[PDB]
Amino acid sequence: LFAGTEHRAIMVDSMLHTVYRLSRGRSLTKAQRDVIEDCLMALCRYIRPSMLQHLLRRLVFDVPILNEFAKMPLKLLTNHYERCWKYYCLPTGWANFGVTSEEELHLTRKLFWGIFDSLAHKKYDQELYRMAMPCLCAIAPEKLDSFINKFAEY
Amino acid sequence: MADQLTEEQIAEFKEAFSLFDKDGDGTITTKALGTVMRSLGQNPTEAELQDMINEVGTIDFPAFLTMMARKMKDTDSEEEIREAFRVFDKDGNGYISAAALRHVMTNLGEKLTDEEVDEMIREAGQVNYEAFVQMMTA
Amino acid sequence: PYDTLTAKEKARDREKAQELLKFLQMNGYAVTRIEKRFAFGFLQQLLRWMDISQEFIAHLEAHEQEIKFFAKILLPLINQYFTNHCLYFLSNKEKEMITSLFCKLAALVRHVVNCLHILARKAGLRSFFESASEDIEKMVENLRQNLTYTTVALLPVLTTLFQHIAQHDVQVSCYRTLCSIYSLRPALGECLARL
Amino acid sequence: DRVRIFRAEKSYTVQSGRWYFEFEAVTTGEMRVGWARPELRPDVELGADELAYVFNGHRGQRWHLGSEPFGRPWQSGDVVGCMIDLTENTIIFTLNGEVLMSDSGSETAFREIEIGDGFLPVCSLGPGQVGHLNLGQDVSSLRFFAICGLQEGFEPFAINMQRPVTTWFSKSLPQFEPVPPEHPHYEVARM
Amino acid sequence: RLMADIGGLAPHVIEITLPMLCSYLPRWSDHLNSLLGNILRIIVNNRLAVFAQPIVSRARPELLHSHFIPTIGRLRKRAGKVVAEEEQLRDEFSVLCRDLYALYPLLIRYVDNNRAHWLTEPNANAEELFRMVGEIFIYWSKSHNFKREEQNFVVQNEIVATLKKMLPIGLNMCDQDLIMLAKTRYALKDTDEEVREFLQNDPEKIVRRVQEVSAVLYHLEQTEHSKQRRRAVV
């Protein structure tokens, strides 16, 4: 039901900021964070891809580090890419939603920067590689002081 | 309930709780309870331990067993589902044969009806090995 | 962090900083030190990955993270790519880079069966293609871990024949291989004759 | 100027049975052939709305609420067939006696199309495009009706009509028309 | 040349000749027609890979069409013999019929690939041959006992080729009261067109074919047609 929130896009953007922050709480239990992550994935599935970019701005900073619990965000990103690959890549996009601008394009460029970062970030790990390969696969002078005074004067 | 969760571990739990309580009156501190849990082998994080203690310094043997049962109930649910996939027949992979379903149902022990078998098949002719079992597991 | 933040995130403040430089110019004292570009650089990264794969093959001819994803994810990563961008490469600098990568792929494999499809789809590239044709002729002569390599090449031979059919120094080697096939799994021979 | 859409009179609306006509694509161009709902807005580009079902032969595409790449491009002097069975709720497109196929290879051009108010022949002529439209007034006039459709039970559109069927074209000349009460963009209130 | 050797070769020889046929197809006429005739003769004399890659299509073979009609008749005779053996009184006959139809469907598909050119011609004795072939295919299809093995063989070999071939020949096979007469015959199970006054109120063979088509249409219509205890069962 969250999808179609274009009339009040502010609410969708706000919840997106809060859910990801709450997912990485310092004091948490396994089920408590698991249900929050499932809620975030379900909300992100049925959303407009263009409106997700505001939270994706922080998501594309968090993803390349992959320091803690990156597997669930990696799977969520894989799902979002599988949902909107033809929308974000092809010039026509998808019919109902308007074609995304270059903002999402450079966001995907930063995502591929993260792909560089995580390609050789850590050593071998069976679970890590097994659960991280779908995201990589589905990614596609005094005078100067006087000038300063002049700037201040301006 | 409590008897149906675990039976053999009661001796180890009683020995650990008796060793933890120096006074012997049956009261164990929260830090002592965590130390006893670590000595048992669970080694659970203190974040869940505090919540379990609050839900259940003055922790006694019955309260300790209630908390241990609450903590240990979760793992058996995950452990039980795995065996059911291959329990139906030797050919666990792609277990869509009617013979495997008949063996699972006619000898289930709960007297599941043939109509109940059809309902389970249609619960969601080919059905994946895990697709119908996940719907049944809920 | 701002550096992490995009120019749009910088917004007016970045412009204001630019304005400050302009103000310095007015003072007379001043301090002086892509979407399609992303698409082109993405094939540039494909060429870089081809070079990395050549280095990895050379090392394997003689565990680490590099070897780890070379064994595990590099082939699936490039596979999912070339599945999504099969005709994107074909429709050029990107085409030349892809051709060089494909030419070096045969040598890297020589040093999985699914990697044959990846291998299926400029002086150095031409030399590599000529060397691959000569190696194919040598394997054909040998036929007239060796068996597995021969079978993998025969499957790659069928893939190359399919590519040549789709198209419609290596010519001499192809003629020699055709003559050997005529002199000596008949579907592979039929595909070679059609190519 | 704009695409000069042609359609038959509303009185000739057919709501049951299977009917067919043949259109001669003398000159290749932006041209579409098929059926449409009785209420068709002359301004909308054909196939953008849910009113019509056609096939663009210049690009080898079929159009209904959008564009689909089904069908093969035609050539000059090619006869395009029009298949529809309201009883079977199915529509097919034919080209010089060859049944067209979609990406999946299904013969049907459009499926699960409700009968609605009815359907009538419709065709659009783009700039520089000239064709000859036959509604099957004479049975022998149809070139490819015997090859396909004759054995399938389909019938020519003007099989029994004793007079030529009147068609309605769209006049590019603008004329004043009253404001629609439910106009999507502009509304007026009498104060 | 190679075509002469292929014609004179009438199973490594067949496999080797298949590469020669593929080479002739990409190189290319009269030689193509001769190769198609030789392939038809080899198929009549005699393995799904043999029918694989049928690039060459005979536009006007004439003689090969007649041979395929005799080939269709031979396949129909074999299928009818298998069906009679099965209906006499075990599963070996059905298994043999399925094995034979595994290769026969390849020939049926090969015929149906170029059947469009024959369908261009309105009337011929090929129409009667196609009617007989459709009758044989309907005899196989309506036999659900034979279908129990035919579907298994098709799945193992890897929505019916015979049904699709019969459907393309439906236009070539064809008053409207013949349909009602066919329905009455199906309800009464009368093979011959005994009720001529019904039509009055050559053509007899057409009525029998209409009855067979009505049976095929009936077959096609038939083809077209707890949480509380969850813990306990788990």
CSV table of N, CA and C in Angstrom, one decimal, chain C residues 45-164:
chain,number,residue,atom,x,y,z
C,45,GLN,N,36.3,-0.5,-17.3
C,45,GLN,CA,36.4,-1.4,-16.2
C,45,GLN,C,36.3,-2.9,-16.6
C,46,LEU,N,35.5,-3.2,-17.7
C,46,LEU,CA,35.6,-4.5,-18.2
C,46,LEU,C,36.9,-4.9,-18.8
C,47,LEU,N,37.6,-3.9,-19.5
C,47,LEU,CA,38.9,-4.1,-20.0
C,47,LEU,C,39.9,-4.3,-18.8
C,48,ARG,N,39.8,-3.5,-17.8
C,48,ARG,CA,40.6,-3.6,-16.6
C,48,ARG,C,40.4,-5.0,-16.0
C,49,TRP,N,39.2,-5.5,-15.9
C,49,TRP,CA,39.0,-6.8,-15.4
C,49,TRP,C,39.5,-7.9,-16.3
C,50,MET,N,39.6,-7.7,-17.6
C,50,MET,CA,40.2,-8.6,-18.5
C,50,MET,C,41.7,-8.7,-18.2
C,51,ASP,N,42.3,-7.5,-18.0
C,51,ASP,CA,43.8,-7.5,-17.6
C,51,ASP,C,44.0,-8.2,-16.3
C,52,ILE,N,43.1,-8.0,-15.3
C,52,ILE,CA,43.2,-8.7,-14.0
C,52,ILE,C,43.1,-10.2,-14.2
C,53,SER,N,42.1,-10.6,-15.1
C,53,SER,CA,42.0,-12.0,-15.3
C,53,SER,C,43.2,-12.6,-16.0
C,54,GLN,N,43.8,-11.9,-16.9
C,54,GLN,CA,45.0,-12.4,-17.5
C,54,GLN,C,46.1,-12.5,-16.5
C,55,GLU,N,46.3,-11.6,-15.6
C,55,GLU,CA,47.2,-11.7,-14.5
C,55,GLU,C,46.9,-12.9,-13.6
C,56,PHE,N,45.6,-13.1,-13.3
C,56,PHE,CA,45.2,-14.2,-12.4
C,56,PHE,C,45.5,-15.5,-13.1
C,57,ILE,N,45.3,-15.6,-14.4
C,57,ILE,CA,45.6,-16.8,-15.1
C,57,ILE,C,47.1,-17.1,-15.1
C,58,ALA,N,47.9,-16.0,-15.3
C,58,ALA,CA,49.3,-16.2,-15.3
C,58,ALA,C,49.8,-16.7,-13.9
C,59,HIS,N,49.2,-16.1,-12.8
C,59,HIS,CA,49.5,-16.6,-11.5
C,59,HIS,C,49.1,-18.0,-11.2
C,60,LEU,N,47.9,-18.4,-11.7
C,60,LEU,CA,47.4,-19.8,-11.5
C,60,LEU,C,48.3,-20.8,-12.3
C,61,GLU,N,48.9,-20.3,-13.4
C,61,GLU,CA,49.8,-21.2,-14.2
C,61,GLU,C,51.0,-21.6,-13.3
C,62,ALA,N,51.5,-20.6,-12.5
C,62,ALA,CA,52.6,-20.9,-11.6
C,62,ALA,C,52.1,-21.7,-10.4
C,63,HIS,N,43.1,-18.9,-3.2
C,63,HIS,CA,43.6,-18.7,-1.8
C,63,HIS,C,43.4,-17.3,-1.4
C,64,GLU,N,44.2,-16.4,-2.0
C,64,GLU,CA,44.1,-15.0,-1.7
C,64,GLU,C,42.7,-14.4,-2.2
C,65,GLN,N,42.4,-13.2,-1.8
C,65,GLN,CA,41.1,-12.6,-2.2
C,65,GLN,C,41.0,-12.5,-3.7
C,66,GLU,N,42.1,-12.1,-4.4
C,66,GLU,CA,42.0,-12.1,-5.8
C,66,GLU,C,41.7,-13.4,-6.4
C,67,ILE,N,42.5,-14.4,-6.0
C,67,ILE,CA,42.2,-15.8,-6.5
C,67,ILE,C,40.8,-16.2,-6.1
C,68,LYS,N,40.4,-15.8,-4.9
C,68,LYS,CA,39.1,-16.2,-4.4
C,68,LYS,C,37.9,-15.8,-5.3
C,69,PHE,N,37.9,-14.5,-5.6
C,69,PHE,CA,36.7,-14.1,-6.4
C,69,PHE,C,37.0,-14.4,-7.9
C,70,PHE,N,38.2,-14.6,-8.3
C,70,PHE,CA,38.5,-15.1,-9.6
C,70,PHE,C,37.9,-16.5,-9.8
C,71,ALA,N,38.0,-17.4,-8.7
C,71,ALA,CA,37.4,-18.7,-8.8
C,71,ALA,C,35.9,-18.7,-8.6
C,72,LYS,N,35.4,-17.8,-7.7
C,72,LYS,CA,34.0,-17.8,-7.3
C,72,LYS,C,33.1,-16.9,-8.0
C,73,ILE,N,33.4,-15.6,-8.0
C,73,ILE,CA,32.4,-14.6,-8.4
C,73,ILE,C,32.8,-13.9,-9.8
C,74,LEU,N,34.0,-13.9,-10.2
C,74,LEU,CA,34.4,-13.2,-11.4
C,74,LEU,C,33.7,-13.7,-12.6
C,75,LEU,N,33.7,-15.1,-12.8
C,75,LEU,CA,33.0,-15.7,-13.9
C,75,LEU,C,31.5,-15.4,-13.8
C,76,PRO,N,30.8,-15.7,-12.6
C,76,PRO,CA,29.4,-15.3,-12.6
C,76,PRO,C,29.1,-13.8,-12.7
C,77,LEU,N,30.0,-12.9,-12.2
C,77,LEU,CA,29.8,-11.5,-12.4
C,77,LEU,C,29.8,-11.1,-13.9
C,78,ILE,N,30.9,-11.5,-14.6
C,78,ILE,CA,30.9,-11.2,-16.0
C,78,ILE,C,29.8,-11.9,-16.8
C,79,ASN,N,29.4,-13.1,-16.3
C,79,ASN,CA,28.3,-13.8,-17.0
C,79,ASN,C,27.0,-13.1,-16.9
C,80,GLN,N,26.6,-12.6,-15.7
C,80,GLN,CA,25.4,-11.9,-15.5
C,80,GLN,C,25.5,-10.6,-16.3
C,81,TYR,N,26.7,-9.9,-16.3
C,81,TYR,CA,26.9,-8.8,-17.2
C,81,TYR,C,26.6,-9.1,-18.6
C,82,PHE,N,27.3,-10.0,-19.2
C,82,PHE,CA,27.2,-10.2,-20.6
C,82,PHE,C,25.8,-10.8,-21.0
C,83,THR,N,25.1,-11.4,-20.0
C,83,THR,CA,23.7,-11.8,-20.2
C,83,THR,C,22.9,-10.5,-20.3
C,84,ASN,N,23.1,-9.5,-19.4
C,84,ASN,CA,22.3,-8.3,-19.5
C,84,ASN,C,22.7,-7.4,-20.7
C,85,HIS,N,24.0,-7.5,-21.1
C,85,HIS,CA,24.5,-6.6,-22.1
C,85,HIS,C,25.1,-7.4,-23.3
C,86,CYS,N,24.3,-8.4,-23.7
C,86,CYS,CA,24.7,-9.2,-24.9
C,86,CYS,C,24.9,-8.3,-26.1
C,87,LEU,N,23.7,-7.7,-26.5
C,87,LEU,CA,23.7,-6.8,-27.7
C,87,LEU,C,24.2,-5.4,-27.4
C,88,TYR,N,24.3,-5.0,-26.1
C,88,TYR,CA,24.8,-3.7,-25.7
C,88,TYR,C,26.2,-3.5,-26.2
C,89,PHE,N,27.1,-4.5,-26.0
C,89,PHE,CA,28.5,-4.4,-26.5
C,89,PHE,C,28.4,-4.2,-28.1
C,90,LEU,N,27.7,-5.1,-28.7
C,90,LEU,CA,27.7,-5.1,-30.2
C,90,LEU,C,27.1,-3.8,-30.7
C,91,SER,N,26.0,-3.3,-30.1
C,91,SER,CA,25.4,-2.0,-30.5
C,91,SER,C,24.8,-1.4,-29.2
C,92,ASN,N,34.2,0.8,-32.7
C,92,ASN,CA,33.8,1.2,-31.4
C,92,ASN,C,35.0,0.8,-30.4
C,93,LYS,N,35.3,1.7,-29.5
C,93,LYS,CA,36.4,1.4,-28.5
C,93,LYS,C,35.9,0.3,-27.6
C,94,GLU,N,34.6,0.3,-27.1
C,94,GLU,CA,34.1,-0.7,-26.3
C,94,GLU,C,34.1,-2.1,-27.0
C,95,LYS,N,33.8,-2.1,-28.3
C,95,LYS,CA,33.8,-3.3,-29.1
C,95,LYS,C,35.2,-3.8,-29.2
C,96,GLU,N,36.2,-3.0,-29.4
C,96,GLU,CA,37.6,-3.4,-29.5
C,96,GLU,C,38.1,-4.0,-28.2
C,97,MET,N,37.7,-3.3,-27.0
C,97,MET,CA,38.1,-3.8,-25.7
C,97,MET,C,37.5,-5.2,-25.5
C,98,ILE,N,36.2,-5.4,-25.8
C,98,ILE,CA,35.5,-6.6,-25.7
C,98,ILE,C,36.2,-7.7,-26.5
C,99,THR,N,36.6,-7.4,-27.7
C,99,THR,CA,37.2,-8.3,-28.6
C,99,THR,C,38.6,-8.7,-28.0
C,100,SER,N,39.4,-7.8,-27.5
C,100,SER,CA,40.6,-8.1,-26.9
C,100,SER,C,40.4,-9.0,-25.7
C,101,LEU,N,39.4,-8.7,-24.9
C,101,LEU,CA,39.1,-9.5,-23.7
C,101,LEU,C,38.8,-10.9,-24.1
C,102,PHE,N,37.9,-11.1,-25.2
C,102,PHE,CA,37.6,-12.4,-25.6
C,102,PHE,C,38.8,-13.2,-26.2
C,103,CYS,N,39.6,-12.5,-26.9
C,103,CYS,CA,40.8,-13.1,-27.4
C,103,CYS,C,41.7,-13.6,-26.3
C,104,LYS,N,41.9,-12.8,-25.3
C,104,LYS,CA,42.7,-13.2,-24.1
C,104,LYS,C,42.0,-14.3,-23.3
C,105,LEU,N,40.7,-14.4,-23.4
C,105,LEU,CA,40.0,-15.4,-22.6
C,105,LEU,C,40.4,-16.8,-22.9
C,106,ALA,N,40.6,-17.1,-24.2
C,106,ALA,CA,41.0,-18.4,-24.6
C,106,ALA,C,42.3,-18.8,-24.0
C,107,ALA,N,43.3,-17.9,-24.1
C,107,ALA,CA,44.6,-18.1,-23.5
C,107,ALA,C,44.5,-18.3,-22.0
C,108,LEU,N,43.7,-17.5,-21.3
C,108,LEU,CA,43.5,-17.6,-19.9
C,108,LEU,C,42.9,-18.9,-19.5
C,109,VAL,N,41.9,-19.4,-20.3
C,109,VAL,CA,41.3,-20.7,-20.0
C,109,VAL,C,42.4,-21.8,-20.3
C,110,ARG,N,43.2,-21.7,-21.3
C,110,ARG,CA,44.2,-22.6,-21.5
C,110,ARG,C,45.3,-22.6,-20.4
C,111,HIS,N,45.6,-21.4,-19.9
C,111,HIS,CA,46.5,-21.2,-18.8
C,111,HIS,C,47.9,-21.9,-19.1
C,112,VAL,N,35.1,-23.3,-16.4
C,112,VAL,CA,34.0,-24.2,-16.3
C,112,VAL,C,33.3,-24.3,-17.7
C,113,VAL,N,32.4,-25.3,-17.8
C,113,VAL,CA,31.7,-25.5,-19.1
C,113,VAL,C,30.8,-24.3,-19.4
C,114,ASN,N,30.2,-23.7,-18.4
C,114,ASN,CA,29.4,-22.5,-18.6
C,114,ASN,C,30.2,-21.3,-19.0
C,115,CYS,N,31.5,-21.3,-18.8
C,115,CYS,CA,32.4,-20.2,-19.3
C,115,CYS,C,32.6,-20.3,-20.8
C,116,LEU,N,32.2,-21.4,-21.4
C,116,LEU,CA,32.3,-21.4,-22.9
C,116,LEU,C,31.3,-20.4,-23.5
C,117,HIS,N,30.1,-20.3,-22.9
C,117,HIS,CA,29.2,-19.3,-23.4
C,117,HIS,C,29.7,-17.9,-23.2
C,118,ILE,N,30.4,-17.6,-22.1
C,118,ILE,CA,31.0,-16.3,-21.9
C,118,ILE,C,32.1,-16.1,-22.9
C,119,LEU,N,32.9,-17.1,-23.2
C,119,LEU,CA,34.0,-16.9,-24.2
C,119,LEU,C,33.3,-16.7,-25.6
C,120,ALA,N,32.2,-17.3,-25.8
C,120,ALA,CA,31.5,-17.1,-27.1
C,120,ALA,C,31.2,-15.6,-27.4
C,121,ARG,N,30.6,-14.9,-26.4
C,121,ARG,CA,30.3,-13.5,-26.5
C,121,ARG,C,30.3,-12.8,-25.1
C,122,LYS,N,44.4,-2.6,-32.9
C,122,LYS,CA,44.0,-4.0,-32.5
C,122,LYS,C,44.9,-5.0,-33.0
C,123,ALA,N,46.2,-4.6,-33.1
C,123,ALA,CA,47.2,-5.6,-33.5
C,123,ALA,C,47.4,-6.7,-32.5
C,124,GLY,N,47.3,-6.4,-31.2
C,124,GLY,CA,47.4,-7.5,-30.2
C,124,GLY,C,46.2,-8.4,-30.3
C,125,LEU,N,45.0,-7.9,-30.5
C,125,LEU,CA,43.9,-8.7,-30.6
C,125,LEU,C,43.9,-9.6,-31.8
C,126,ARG,N,44.4,-9.1,-32.9
C,126,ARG,CA,44.6,-9.9,-34.1
C,126,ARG,C,45.6,-11.0,-33.9
C,127,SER,N,46.7,-10.6,-33.3
C,127,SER,CA,47.7,-11.7,-33.0
C,127,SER,C,47.2,-12.7,-32.1
C,128,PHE,N,46.4,-12.4,-31.1
C,128,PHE,CA,45.8,-13.3,-30.2
C,128,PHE,C,44.8,-14.2,-30.9
C,129,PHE,N,44.0,-13.6,-31.8
C,129,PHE,CA,43.1,-14.4,-32.6
C,129,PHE,C,43.8,-15.4,-33.5
C,130,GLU,N,44.9,-15.0,-34.1
C,130,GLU,CA,45.7,-15.9,-35.0
C,130,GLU,C,46.3,-17.0,-34.2
C,131,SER,N,46.8,-16.7,-33.0
C,131,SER,CA,47.4,-17.7,-32.1
C,131,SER,C,46.3,-18.7,-31.7
C,132,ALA,N,45.1,-18.2,-31.4
C,132,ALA,CA,44.0,-19.1,-31.0
C,132,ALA,C,43.6,-20.0,-32.2
C,133,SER,N,43.6,-19.5,-33.4
C,133,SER,CA,43.3,-20.3,-34.6
C,133,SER,C,44.4,-21.4,-34.8
C,134,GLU,N,45.7,-21.0,-34.6
C,134,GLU,CA,46.7,-22.0,-34.7
C,134,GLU,C,46.6,-23.0,-33.6
C,135,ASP,N,46.2,-22.7,-32.4
C,135,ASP,CA,46.0,-23.6,-31.3
C,135,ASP,C,44.9,-24.6,-31.7
C,136,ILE,N,43.8,-24.0,-32.3
C,136,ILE,CA,42.7,-24.9,-32.7
C,136,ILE,C,43.1,-25.9,-33.7
C,137,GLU,N,43.9,-25.4,-34.7
C,137,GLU,CA,44.4,-26.3,-35.7
C,137,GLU,C,45.3,-27.4,-35.1
C,138,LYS,N,46.2,-27.0,-34.1
C,138,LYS,CA,47.0,-28.0,-33.4
C,138,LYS,C,46.2,-29.0,-32.7
C,139,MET,N,45.1,-28.6,-32.0
C,139,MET,CA,44.2,-29.5,-31.3
C,139,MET,C,43.5,-30.4,-32.3
C,140,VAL,N,43.1,-29.9,-33.4
C,140,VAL,CA,42.5,-30.7,-34.5
C,140,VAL,C,43.5,-31.8,-35.0
C,141,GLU,N,44.7,-31.4,-35.2
C,141,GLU,CA,45.7,-32.4,-35.6
C,141,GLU,C,46.0,-33.4,-34.5
C,142,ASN,N,46.0,-33.0,-33.3
C,142,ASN,CA,46.2,-33.9,-32.2
C,142,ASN,C,45.1,-34.9,-32.1
C,143,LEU,N,43.9,-34.5,-32.3
C,143,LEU,CA,42.7,-35.4,-32.2
C,143,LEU,C,42.8,-36.4,-33.3
C,144,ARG,N,43.2,-36.0,-34.5
C,144,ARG,CA,43.4,-36.9,-35.6
C,144,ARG,C,44.6,-37.8,-35.4
C,145,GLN,N,44.4,-34.5,-18.7
C,145,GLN,CA,43.4,-33.4,-18.8
C,145,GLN,C,43.3,-32.9,-20.3
C,146,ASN,N,43.8,-33.7,-21.2
C,146,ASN,CA,43.8,-33.4,-22.6
C,146,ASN,C,42.4,-33.6,-23.2
C,147,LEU,N,41.7,-34.7,-22.7
C,147,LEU,CA,40.4,-35.0,-23.3
C,147,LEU,C,39.4,-33.9,-22.9
C,148,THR,N,39.4,-33.5,-21.6
C,148,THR,CA,38.5,-32.5,-21.1
C,148,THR,C,38.7,-31.2,-21.9
C,149,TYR,N,40.0,-30.8,-22.1
C,149,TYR,CA,40.3,-29.6,-22.9
C,149,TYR,C,39.8,-29.7,-24.3
C,150,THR,N,40.0,-30.9,-24.9
C,150,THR,CA,39.6,-31.1,-26.3
C,150,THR,C,38.0,-31.0,-26.4
C,151,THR,N,37.3,-31.5,-25.4
C,151,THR,CA,35.9,-31.4,-25.4
C,151,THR,C,35.4,-30.0,-25.2
C,152,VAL,N,36.1,-29.3,-24.3
C,152,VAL,CA,35.7,-27.9,-24.1
C,152,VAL,C,36.0,-27.0,-25.3
C,153,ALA,N,37.1,-27.3,-26.0
C,153,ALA,CA,37.4,-26.6,-27.3
C,153,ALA,C,36.4,-26.9,-28.3
C,154,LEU,N,36.0,-28.2,-28.4
C,154,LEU,CA,35.0,-28.6,-29.4
C,154,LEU,C,33.6,-27.9,-29.2
C,155,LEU,N,33.2,-27.8,-27.9
C,155,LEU,CA,32.1,-26.9,-27.6
C,155,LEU,C,32.4,-25.5,-27.9
C,156,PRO,N,33.5,-24.9,-27.5
C,156,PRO,CA,33.9,-23.6,-28.0
C,156,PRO,C,34.0,-23.5,-29.5
C,157,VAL,N,34.3,-24.5,-30.2
C,157,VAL,CA,34.3,-24.6,-31.6
C,157,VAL,C,32.9,-24.4,-32.2
C,158,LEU,N,32.0,-25.1,-31.6
C,158,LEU,CA,30.6,-24.9,-31.9
C,158,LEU,C,30.1,-23.5,-31.7
C,159,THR,N,30.5,-22.9,-30.5
C,159,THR,CA,30.1,-21.6,-30.2
C,159,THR,C,30.7,-20.6,-31.2
C,160,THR,N,31.9,-20.8,-31.6
C,160,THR,CA,32.5,-19.9,-32.6
C,160,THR,C,31.8,-20.1,-34.0
C,161,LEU,N,31.4,-21.3,-34.3
C,161,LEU,CA,30.7,-21.5,-35.6
C,161,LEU,C,29.4,-20.8,-35.5
C,162,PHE,N,28.7,-20.9,-34.4
C,162,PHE,CA,27.4,-20.2,-34.3
C,162,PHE,C,27.6,-18.7,-34.4
C,163,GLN,N,28.7,-18.1,-33.8
C,163,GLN,CA,29.0,-16.7,-33.9
C,163,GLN,C,29.3,-16.3,-35.4
C,164,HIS,N,30.0,-17.2,-36.1
C,164,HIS,CA,30.3,-16.9,-37.5
C,164,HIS,C,29.0,-16.9,-38.3
